[PDB]
Design a protein around this ligand. Structure first.
Ligand SMILES: NC(=O)C1=CN([C@@H]2O[C@H](COP(=O)(O)OP(=O)(O)OC[C@H]3O[C@@H](n4cnc5c(N)ncnc54)[C@H](OP(=O)(O)O)[C@@H]3O)[C@@H](O)[C@H]2O)C=CC1
Length: 299
């Protein structure tokens, strides 16, 4: 039920997300349904919630955590610095740097620390932020040494984006690179999963159900239909299990109770190597990219 990070710290192997579906669009009101669903998820056995400054859902996470009252050490919380989009237009975190942003978010969360803190997107430059990408990492390093983030990482980084940090003289290296990853998207940017895995950086996969949520009709429908019958598992479940068997941590979300339990049952079964391999092969027949579409030139 968990992965082990580079530094030996454990991370629960499925996460409940609070972006996409729940991402606030021109309001800051509490999302009461979300808080409800977070409670249900935690009480059902989720122990890893994926959040971000830009989502506007960090308050909800903190309320749900307080209402459930799990031991703090048993829960794994991710937050992310709103670094901005690929235009470097300056539309990003309202705080002066990632360290001050994480501090403000911790107040929204009602927590002493997050378990993982990420640079959300790799578009940081002095002209747009007052600091460059490696100094943003340095802020993350201050947060880590201070105790404000147990682990630090990145998101939506290419290999060259990773090299900016690894090649600098730094205290530590990212332990996670959270990217879009699904059977229809096996490499968000070229060689990223393979390069990261070889360096010991854990890949977390968001948008893992793309094939099913936005990818129908496509070449996986026939394959998933057959394995659903054979495993007595639904297609969402097969896809997520398959992500796990690639050594990747899937991040999903839902507003439906029955799906909370579907997701948590991905650890009660195994796909035969041959069936895993057919998903990976047939996956490659179609390309589906839902996020970070500046990367679409690679498709
Ligand atoms: N770092 C980054 O740039 C990004 C990070 N993320 C993180 O990852 C999280 C998850 O991403 P998302 O893309 O939503 O994840 P998924 O790929 O897992 O899609 C989840 C969606 O699938 C639906 N769903 C679940 N099961 C089925 C089913 N079998 N058939 C059809 N639909 C189904 C859910 O709808 P329903 O509610 O109706 O069940 C939900 O809306 C985000 O909330 C966010 O926290 C996401 C995007 C970018």
């Amino acid at each position: 039920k968990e992965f082990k990070l580079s530094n030996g710290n454990k991370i629960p192997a499925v996460a409940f997300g609070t972006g996409t579906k729940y991402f606030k669009r021109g309001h800051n009101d509490l999302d009461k349904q979300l808080i409800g669903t977070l409670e249900l998820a935690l009480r059902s056995g989720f122990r890893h919630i994926d959040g971000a400054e830009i989502y506007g859902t960090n308050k909800e996470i903190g309320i749900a955590l307080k209402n459930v009252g799990l031991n703090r050490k048993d829960v794994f919380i991710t937050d992310k610095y709103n670094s901005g989009n690929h235009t470097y237009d300056g539309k990003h975190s309202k705080h002066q740097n990632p360290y001050n942003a994480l501090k403000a978010d911790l107040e929204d969360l009602g927590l002493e620390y997050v378990d993982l803190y990420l640079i959300h997107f790799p578009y940081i430059s002095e002209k747009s932020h007052g600091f460059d990408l490696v100094e943003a990492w340095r802020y993350l390093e201050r947060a880590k040494n201070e105790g404000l983030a147990r682990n630090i990482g990145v998101s939506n980084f290419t290999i060259e984006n990773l090299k900016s940090i690894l090649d600098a003289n730094t205290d530590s290296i990212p332990v996670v690179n959270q990217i879009e990853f699904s059977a229809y998207l096996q490499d968000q940017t070229p060689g990223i999963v393979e390069y990261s895995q070889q360096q010991g950086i854990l890949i977390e996969a968001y948008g893992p159900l793309g094939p099913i949520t936005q990818g129908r009709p496509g070449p996986l429908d026939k394959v998933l239909s057959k394995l659903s019958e054979k495993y007595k598992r639904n297609e969402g479940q097969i896809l997520l299990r398959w992500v796990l068997q690639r050594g990747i941590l899937p991040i999903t979300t839902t507003s439906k109770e029955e799906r909370i339990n579907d997701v948590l049952e991905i650890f009660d079964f195994e796909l035969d190597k041959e069936d895993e391999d057919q998903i990976t092969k047939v996956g490659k027949e179609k390309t589906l990219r839902q996020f970070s579409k500046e990367y679409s030139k690679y498709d």
